[PDB]
Amino acid sequence: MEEVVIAGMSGKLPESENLQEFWDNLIGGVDMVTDDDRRWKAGLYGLPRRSGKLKDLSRFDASFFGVHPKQAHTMDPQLRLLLEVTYEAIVDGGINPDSLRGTHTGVWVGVSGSETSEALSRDPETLVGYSMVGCQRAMMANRLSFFFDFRGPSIALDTACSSSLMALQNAYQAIHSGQCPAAIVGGINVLLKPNTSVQFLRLGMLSPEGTCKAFDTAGNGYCRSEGVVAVLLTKKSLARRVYATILNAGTNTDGFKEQGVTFPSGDIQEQLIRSLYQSAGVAPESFEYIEAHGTGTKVGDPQELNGITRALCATRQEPLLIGSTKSNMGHPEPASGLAALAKVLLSLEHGLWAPNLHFHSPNPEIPALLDGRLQVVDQPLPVRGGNVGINSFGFGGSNVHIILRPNTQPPPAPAPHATLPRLLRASGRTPEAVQKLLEQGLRHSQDLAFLSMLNDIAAVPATAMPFRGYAVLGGERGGPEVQQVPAGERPLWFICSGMGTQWRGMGLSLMRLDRFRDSILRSDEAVKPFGLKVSQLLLSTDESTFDDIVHSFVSLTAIQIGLIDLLSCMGLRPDGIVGHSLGEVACGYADGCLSQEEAVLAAYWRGQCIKEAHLPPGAMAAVGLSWEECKQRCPPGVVPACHNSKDTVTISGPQAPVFEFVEQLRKEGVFAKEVRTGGMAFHSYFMEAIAPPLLQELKKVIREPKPRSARWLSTSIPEAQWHSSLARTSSAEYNVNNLVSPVLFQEALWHVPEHAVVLEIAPHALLQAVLKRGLKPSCTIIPLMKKDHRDNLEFFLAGIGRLHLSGIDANPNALFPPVEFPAPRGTPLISPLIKWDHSLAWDVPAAEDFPNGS
Template sequence: MEEIVIAGIAGRLPESDNLQEFWDNLIQGVDLVTEDDRRWKPGLYGLPARNGKLKEINKFDASFFGVHPKQAHTMDPQLRLLLEVSYEAIVDGGINPSDLRGTKTGVWVGVSGSEAGEAFSRDPEELLGYSMTGCQRAMFANRISYFFDFKGPSLAIDTACSSSLLALENAYKAIYHGQCDAAIVGGVNLLLKPNTSVQFMKLGMLSPDGTCKSFDASGNGYCRSEAACAVLVTKKSMAKRVYATILNAGSNTDGYKEQGVTFPSGEVQQQLLNSLYKEAGIPTNEVEYVEAHGTGTKVGDPQEVNGIVNVFCNSEREPLLIGSTKSNMGHPEPASGLAALAKVILSLEHGVWAPNLHYKNPNPDIPALQDGRIQVVSKPIPVKGGIVGINSFGFGGSNVHVILRPNKKKLSSTESSLPLPRLVQVCGRTQEAVEALIEKSRNLASDASLVNLLNSISGIPPSAMPYRGYTLVGTESDVKEIQQSQTTGRPLWNGDTMERDGP
């Protein structure tokens, strides 16, 4: 069976417009949870004053995505963000989105609610009907399939906090079983009004000080947060870029528990992990790092981590590294699985595990933190290249785990250097975008993979990307040109002939 890989990724995370910003914040130990009135007045209804928020959710290039202005005004900002990050994930994979039109590509989206839909439908006399196509959760996946003309399965998944990682698990299995050749997997969460937060607070789930103190003795609940992420998952033969290989993925459910539906079952979580590693034939001592669900709740952390210890630390081995991105940015609920995946991918790409925040005193209910069998990554630690596991659990008992193998065939900087001056072609919606890409290509001129990716996506139709530009890298020459093209079949210049002598 052909391997299935993570081939592209994009996202918006708290205080981070893209994944490069997110990585810079993670590695610098920035607390991405803030206290301000971008959503509602801090402390309203007795809510925690802090939460994690995206920088910007009020802008959308409706014409680019073929959305009528009337529809755009009543489209959930969550869907607008999903369209954007889905496009970016495909391009990040070095694939021209138009090349996927009509293909058996699936879409799975993890999403739990539409607060915008509730707001748009308050007054029946003002309804236009457009909010149905803009806010129905089915449309979060179906609109993506419609815009890109994907013919594979298209569905939204809601298992609360494990939604987006279950979406990834579903996509992996669909490709594995031949239902589709590739998939876009998305996850999104926005905090548009305080009602949902009030309900979680009344259930006693939220940290009063708005901090996820994962694995710490002072853990007292979780902090709500926003995120929008998308990944491109493909068969390896189709991928132009490989971030990691998915070795296995699976899910199960807690079932009945005497303590109640929201009480987590470490035993059932443990059963899931044992079955997945056994099925994949992976010795558990080969696992280097586990990105835990790690919300920082008094019950959840011990249930999860003690189960992790029973699976991975039952033989002689180096300490198992664990972390939780929720300590850095809060808990984006249905999008949390893909936010965790983004942190893992970024750590693998940069060769260092991003550190947790707010870990000072080990939780006394997790003995392995005291005896050294498990080590919380509280400072940057070099990646050794072992197997990685990711946990994600829904508060109703839906458990998901994904197993990744890092891409060990990554070229070193010397291997990837360009031996000759090379033409780089870029395209964009604006002249400024093309200039920024040209500047980036010059700054990273030795990165052959970047040059190849930019050239691969430069053929996006002018109707979508009307500005075209080129430059030469690997030379002291300052040659560059930018033009606004017309929507005709004739190219502005022929890059193939100019590049025929290149590598």
């Protein structure tokens, strides 16, 4: 009752390390079968010289899959290759494999031989026990279920040549019945000992020329080949990527035949095909292509093709295209179904049917090839539309047939959010893997679904993949950044600065993000009744607006609240919060003890009470003196205000004490930074009378307060008063004490741990130099906005990107509108982009480890 789709694909086929190399060789018309001594001699025992073999067989990333190096040498090579391509298939689906770690997904593998098992057990005096664990035929599925933590059925089955498609049929029935949510289908074949080829030669099944002349007059046998293929099957609701939908799948057996056990029977195959499409409810006119078994034998090809033309070409009125990938590749026996399925799905993805090789004249015993009812694809011709049938028949008599419907999702309509720059994060075992992923993301910068699945597969722990990277796409600067991430957990800390950081155009560039704009409009409707709206303070800003201190207060708190909201939808939960005056006001929303409206009205009421009453113009000169030397060198009535660092302390007072330290700024090395904000002496004794009018207004907004958390480190309260009744809750008296007390921004900074990642929440990171000398040198400081930046959205996205390079997982897909659930076809492949650590070589059995009759 559930729809079953094909979600992922990966493979290793002759002269085809990756699935793309496979496709290229297939459409290139290259003879992937070769005459090389890569496994045994050229023509020993009278064997054919030509065979299809894999490029390499001794490469395995043993540390990733957690196998001991002594156990990896005594493993079946086909199991090592199956582990790697099984990871690559899940990643090709767009699914992180960690989301299937407890589920009931099953594994079905089609194998037919275990030659490594009998090569590794020839000497009973030097045996090891690990050869049983790494080479037994059930372990080809059980090791996959063990590593990927799969709780479903784990079966290895052998059904001769139809073994791989039979596994697909059983996995189909498991998903269809609701037993399993997902499944993995595999198929493996490796040619190691020549005695099996001598057996097939004496049976009469091997061509002397080593060629599958499919549907040809000169066909006299097949050519043996290798291959390791895996696909990922899932229900429709879990699929990020869809290649095709399996309409139906079934099987039968020939039964008794007078001719023999080996001989094919086309009547039972015709019955299987007709019963399948009937039960599926599809008309035979709707087909356009059928991938035949097509092994090239003398008696098998007319039986199969006459069965096809009886079941399908009765009342059709159109030619039916037919092909066979064994003419391009050779015939891997238990892995022939998934290799043909890979060719079909690659042909559907690229829009062109891959041609057949070695087809010159039709077989005269097949009359449908002579009048045009069946047409062999011998040239590349485009895909028009309809269903594709795939059948594979074993020589024992097992018949399997699949009907699948390709997906035809068009590329989406253009949208105004598609012009915004995006983030792309990557991970890998080596720097080259991260470079490959980032450069392929740069090549396809306008493909939104491709970037979404690439961002989805990047959340791997640093112990598994120790190299991470990022690149900002769609911007003007660009540039991949790759570095090695240290292992372990690093705490994330939030620091939000105070006043003096406003400018012309605060956060406009990232007003294009929807969630930031929603937060800004929420703060707008909150201050709307109070004769104010921060939207004109954002868009219609000139120099007559931010010299006011009320507008500066609300335009600081709203921007910090919007940044915290963006970080909260990002998935990030802070471990420690420490602010600075109005930053400490926004720390209430950062901690959750405040909400939007109370924070914005508290900031506006602070500004309103300050602008209501009037006190002598104040100063904020900054001097190059410590905290203790400033108390003894100020005149009476002049108080130190800000304890930023051990060398930077801000003084507060009137103009004549400000003019007093102009002369002492000439003396020695003393800073003469006299930056003021409206000429008002915040954090001073001049506002001891400001609090009682202000406190009255506040009690009407932050009534029934909530207690502060242990993560919030207070900066207006000294350390010995942290347990008092005033500093447990974020009440109205807590906020008015912030204005009348000096900010202690040094003793809060020494409680930050050793390897913390510090995020600065400010419209301009002017506290970055203070935090560098004020914190431990094993900390990372990341700014989020920069004053007078042309595209501040690119600056924000680079901060999120280097947050990925520190070790904190943060998915930038949540910032943008989500992509529709089926990806459109023609989306680029992901499984060729995965690279492993292949610096080591492992043991492979040779031809001398098998009995030669000596």
